[PDB]
Every structure is written in structure tokens, then in C-alpha cells.
From a paper:
Phylogenetically diverse bacteria can carry out chloramphenicol reduction, but only a single enzyme has been described that efficiently catalyzes this reaction, the NfsB nitroreductase from Haemophilus influenzae strain KW20. We found that expression of H. influenzae and Neisseria spp. nfsB genes, but not Pasteurella multocida nfsB, allows Escherichia coli to resist chloramphenicol by nitroreduction. Mass spectrometric analysis confirmed that purified H. influenzae and N. meningitides NfsB enzymes reduce chloramphenicol to amino-chloramphenicol, while kinetics analyses supported the hypothesis that chloramphenicol reduction is a secondary activity. Previous kinetic studies of nitroreductase catalysis revealed that reactions progress by a double-displacement (ping-pong) mechanism that appears to lack the gating steps necessary to impose specificity, explaining the substrate promiscuity of these enzymes.
Previous work has demonstrated that the NfsB enzyme from H. influenzae strain Rd KW20 (Hi KW20) has the ability to reduce chloramphenicol to amino-chloramphenicol in vitro. We previously demonstrated that expression of the nfsB housekeeping gene from H. influenzae KW20 (Hi KW20) is sufficient to confer clinically relevant levels of chloramphenicol resistance in Es. coli. To understand better how variation in the substrate-binding site mediates activity, we solved the crystal structures of the NfsB homologs from Hi KW20, Hi Int1, Hi 86-028NP, and Nm Z2491. We compared the activity of each NfsB homolog against Hi KW20 NfsB because it was the only previously characterized chloramphenicol reductase. Cell-free supernatants from the empty vector control and Es. coli strain expressing the Pm 70 nfsB gene reactions showed negligible derivatization by the Bratton-Marshall reagent, while supernatants from the Es. coli strains expressing H. influenzae or Neisseria nfsB genes showed robust signal, with the strain expressing the Hi KW20 nfsB showing the highest apparent reduction rate. The relative increase in resistance conferred by H. influenzae or Neisseria nfsB expression ranged from approximately a 16-fold increase (Hi KW20 and Hi 86-028NP) down to an ∼2-fold increase (Hi Int1 and Hi 12). The divergence in chloramphenicol resistance and in vitro activity likely reflect the vagaries of heterologous expression in Es. coli and suggest the presence of important subtleties that still need to be accounted for when estimating mobilization risks of cryptic and proto-resistance genes. This is especially evident with the NfsB enzymes from Hi KW20 and Hi Int1. Intuitively, the Ser68-Met74 pair found in Hi 12 NfsB would provide more of the flexibility needed to properly locate and orient Trp71 to make space for the ribose of NADP than the Pro68-Ile74 pair in other H. influenzae NfsB homologs (Pro68-Ala74 in Nm Z2491 NfsB).
Numbering used by the authors:
A (entry chain B): 3 to 220
B (entry chain A): 2 to 220
The structure:
Amino acid sequence: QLTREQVLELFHQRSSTRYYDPTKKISDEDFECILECGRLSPSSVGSEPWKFLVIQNKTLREKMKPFSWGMINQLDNCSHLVVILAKKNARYDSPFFVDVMARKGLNAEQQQAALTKYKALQEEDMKLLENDRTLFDWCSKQTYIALANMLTGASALGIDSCPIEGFHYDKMNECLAEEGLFDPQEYAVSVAATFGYRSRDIAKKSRKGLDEVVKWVG
Amino acid sequence: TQLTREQVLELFHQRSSTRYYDPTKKISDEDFECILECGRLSPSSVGSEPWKFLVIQNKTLREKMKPFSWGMINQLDNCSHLVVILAKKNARYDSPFFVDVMARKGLNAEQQQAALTKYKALQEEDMKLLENDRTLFDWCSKQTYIALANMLTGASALGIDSCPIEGFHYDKMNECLAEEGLFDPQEYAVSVAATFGYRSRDIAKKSRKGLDEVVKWVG
Ligand SMILES: Cc1cc2nc3c(=O)[nH]c(=O)nc-3n(C[C@H](O)[C@H](O)[C@H](O)COP(=O)(O)O)c2cc1C
Ligand SMILES: Cc1cc2nc3c(=O)[nH]c(=O)nc-3n(C[C@H](O)[C@H](O)[C@H](O)COP(=O)(O)O)c2cc1C
Ligand SMILES: [Cl-]
Ligand SMILES: [Cl-]
Ligand SMILES: [Cl-]
């Protein structure tokens, strides 16, 4: 439990860190807790379509620099780097969704019902089976939930972070797949995040005002 | 604001998706503004904040949604607050939308030209978002899922229950909300929703994949 003022200050204190102290490393305990915040995240129909690559290998980090302009300095100095993958071809009738149902412990009639629920959602409600990319982006949207909670959970632990889109996705995919780090038919890169301890004061928040981003329908 | 690893874990564990709300309990105006603030303060790619939070308290409007909102059809009645998050359509690097983005960063003329080439690279080449309208909308949509997550977590921290909602016909929803004059359908479309309030059944146990299945370590 937190007060209103603390809840606010938690989201004011979290800022995108572009300069890490290279003399400070996150403890294994603290980082596993950050990862737990991602794994515990909610996801459409319990799909959990994420995978978290923790890239600590200096050599691999250096390989990413030339195509990762968004984090080119952070690559060198951050404690931890997480590249989040999202599941490809996450169709209602896929072995992937066979597992989803197995985790939910559904019997045979419930599974035919769940499947008709997933079919209408993908095909008609959200029109996700348009092409390969729309279905992938649906899973990727769920991984942005994990991303957000990892940033928030880290900040609560006193750990700074930066979410990262600033890299060439085709090359990053090829780089990690060539390392044998995932099956390029099953997964692709969604988004990444650095973690560590900042070296500079937090810059104050610049957002649109509440009255511009909220519309009340009474 | 600081928490032990024990409390952080409990924070993300205590947050569950509630399907059954108690219609007696209503969130205070102070608490719910706090929840909204969690979305508004969320990070977003190049600071684009491409969301809009529609707060649907109108009881008549909530019923009109039920016939195509199977994911929340019971919840529409009993939940305290309902949020439909919109994402910006066609948030191209060269759009008026990105004129505002740059002004909020206080960029000068030289800084704006450099930023514009950075956005163009990001959208056109690094992320390949400009192939069509839907890929570019979906990118903004992804950023709104960050505001979604943080509103759930902030709600949880205040003792307030939530449920994220994709279970509705998007076309019918976009149409319904746009006909009610709630947004410009050329400028925004529905991205995701979320109900807020207090639960009426017990919190359920979490079924997640193992940490060993979802984490791959590269040391
Ligand atoms: C998905 C996404 C990707 C981002 N990619 C980058 C990036 O690659 N490099 C960078 O320095 N910041 C990046 N940012 C951080 C944003 O620029 C930042 O969140 C925004 O300016 C608001 O500032 P704040 O996070 O300090 O509140 C990204 C943010 C998000 C959520
Ligand atoms: C984007 C999103 C959409 C969801 N859509 C629905 C929905 O339509 N109806 C619903 O009751 N739950 C919905 N869920 C809830 C998930 O099924 C639920 O989060 C998951 O099974 C994990 O349980 P937990 O959130 O209680 O940990 C959605 C979740 C998310 C993140
Ligand atoms: Cl950087
Ligand atoms: Cl400092
Ligand atoms: Cl509008």
C-alpha cells in the first residue's frame, strides 16, 4: 500500500536514464525482482507472449553499438540490458495457445469454448489475422506492459532504467538470432530496456497537462 | 518512494484482473485523479505521449457498449470507473502532432531539424512503421499500453482493483464513441480499455510461466 503522494512521487522519480555509473552494478537479487515484475505482468487472454533476454556479455553489447543509436552510450555503462522478445504467429489454434489453455487448466469442452473466444477476438473483434505483422504487434503490445512494470518496479527498488526503441530492428533480430539466442520463426524483438544507477540528477517531467489528455464523459 | 524486494513482489502480485465488481464502492475523486496521473506521467517513445484517456462514467453510454463488449459485459454495470484509452493515428515524423512533441522539449530551430531526421530514421528505417497506416497506429498503441500498465499498478498501490480490457469489437467501439462526439476518428482510434473499482469475489491465484522459461541469460 502507498499514499497518493507516494504513488505520484514514484512516477515522477522514474526517468529515462541516458548516463549510468559504470562502477555500480545491480545485485542478482534486485535484478531478479525486476524480472519478476515483468513475468507477473498481465496479458490479453493470459498469453504472456514475452521472453526476456538479459544481455550481459560485453562482446555482444559491443556488437550492437553500431546499429543501436538510442542506447549507444548506455550499452557500455549500464548494469543490465533486457531485450524483450514478442511471440510470432500467436494464433488461437497454435501450439502456443495450446499451452495457454494448459496453464489455465481447462477441460475439453472449455477448450473448444476458449478457442471460439480466441477466434472471434483475433479474426473479428481486433482483426489481428490481417497479416503476420498485426498479430505480432498484438503480442508486442502485451510486452510493453511487462516493460512498463519492470521500469516501475526497478524505480521502486531505487534502480534507474531507460526503455529503448532506438535501434535497427532488422539488424538486432539478425544479430541475436545469429547468436542462437532464439528461434527467429517463433519470436522477434519487441523493445529493450537498460537498468543501472544514474550519474546525473533526474530531469523534471515534461508532459501534456491532465486537462489535455483526459476527457470526462459524465 | 522506496520499497523492499519483498514489497515490490507483493505489489505486482496483489494486482489481479477483477471480473466481478461490487457496485456499492466508488473510487474517490482524489484516488482516481491519482490513477489518471500514472498514465499521464508514463514514458513514451520520443516523448510522443500518443494517448487520450476517455473516462466513461455515463451510465447510458456504458449500456450501449455491452452488446459488443463481451470482455467486460458484467463489469460495465458494476465497476466504478471505465477508461477507454485512445492512440494517435498517423503520428508521422512530419505531422503537426510532432510539431507539438518538439515544442514540449523546448528544441530550437537547429535542434528541431536534427530531431526530425532522427524521428524519420526511427520510423522509416529502424522500425519500418511507415509501410501503412495500421503499423504506425500500432506503434502509438504500444506506448498506450505503458500508460495502461502503470494505471493498473498505481491503482493496485492505492488499494483499488482493476481489469484491462481488449474484449470488445473495436470497429463497433470506434464507431460508437466517434458518433457520440468523443474524439475525431481521423485523429485517434480506440487502443485498449480498463475498468476500475473494488472486487466482489476473492482474488484469484496467478498462473504464470516459470521464470526459467521466460528469462534467457546471456553472460
Ligand atoms: C518504448 C520507448 C522507447 C524509447 N526509446 C528510447 C531510446 O532508445 N533512447 C532514449 O534515450 N530514450 C528512449 N525512450 C525514453 C523517452 O524518450 C522518454 O520516456 C520520454 O522522453 C519521457 O521522459 P522520461 O521517461 O524521463 O519521463 C523511449 C521510451 C519508450 C517508452
Ligand atoms: C490488454 C489486456 C486485455 C485483456 N482483456 C480482457 C478482457 O477482455 N476481459 C477480461 O475479463 N480480462 C481481460 N484481460 C485479463 C487477462 O486475461 C488477465 O490479466 C490474465 O489472465 C492474468 O491474470 P491477472 O491479470 O489477474 O494476473 C486482459 C488483459 C490485458 C493485459
Ligand atoms: Cl545512450
Ligand atoms: Cl546522482
Ligand atoms: Cl480528438
